[PDB]
Design a protein around this ligand. Structure first.
Ligand SMILES: Nc1ncnc2c1ncn2[C@@H]1O[C@H](CSCC[C@H](N)C(=O)O)[C@@H](O)[C@H]1O
Length: 185
């Protein structure tokens, strides 16, 4: 993938909701940690970097991260880890939160410059169906699935979803973003 043109930061916040440490075994945490790192790396080279948040950040994910990265995470840019939940961190902007979920009845069609998009930070192989959908509904926050159909004909990894969002900022074309991150082959 080649990037053309001038780097212009987006005002969008993207949140990795890291509240699910207790639902994952050791391999899954290890994988998630690699995926969080890929979100930062994809953000750094993006034509429109966003502000990346990692909320409820702690526990075995935070340990693993520092074990693997050996303190390098403390050097990352446009990156905001916090023990606060997203609901805590963005209470005043609650109306602007959108939790991305494959299980939503709603479909995202554009990323709004004034909105805050949440990705569930979990590697479960989707054995926890409706998990993120349920969490956001109980909070009264809107959810949306990626407009994958009808080029998909479903549940992507944390970093795949991040990468797709970031590429949409660049191209403003979902088909191109999908073609780049999940080519049919
Ligand atoms: N088709 C899709 N549309 C929107 N978000 C998706 C998606 N596939 C994956 N995701 C995102 O990637 C994250 C990890 S995969 C999710 C597994 C979990 N069973 C769940 O309930 O969400 C999700 O939390 C969601 O934020």
């Amino acid at each position: 993938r080649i990037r053309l043109g001038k780097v212009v930061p987006s005002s969008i916040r993207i949140v990795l909701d890291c509240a699910f440490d207790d639902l994952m075994n050791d391999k899954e945490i290890n994988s998630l940690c690699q995926q969080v790192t890929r979100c930062h790396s994809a953000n750094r080279t993006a034509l429109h970097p966003v502000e990346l948040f990692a909320t409820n950040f702690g526990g075995r994910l935070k340990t693993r991260q520092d074990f693997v990265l050996k303190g390098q995470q403390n050097n990352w840019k446009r990156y905001n880890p916090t023990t606060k939940s997203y609901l805590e961190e963005f209470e005043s902007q609650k109306e602007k939160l959108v939790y991305l979920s494959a299980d939503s009845d709603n479909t995202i069609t554009e990323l709004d410059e004034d909105k805050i998009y949440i990705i569930g930070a979990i590697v479960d192989k989707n054995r926890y169906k409706n998990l993120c959908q349920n969490k956001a509904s109980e909070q009264g926050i809107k959810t949306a699935k990626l407009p994958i159909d009808e080029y998909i004909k479903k549940i992507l990894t944390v970093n795949q979803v991040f990468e797709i969002l970031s590429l949409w900022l660049e191209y403003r074309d979902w088909e191109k973003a999908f073609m780049e991150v999940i080519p049919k082959r």
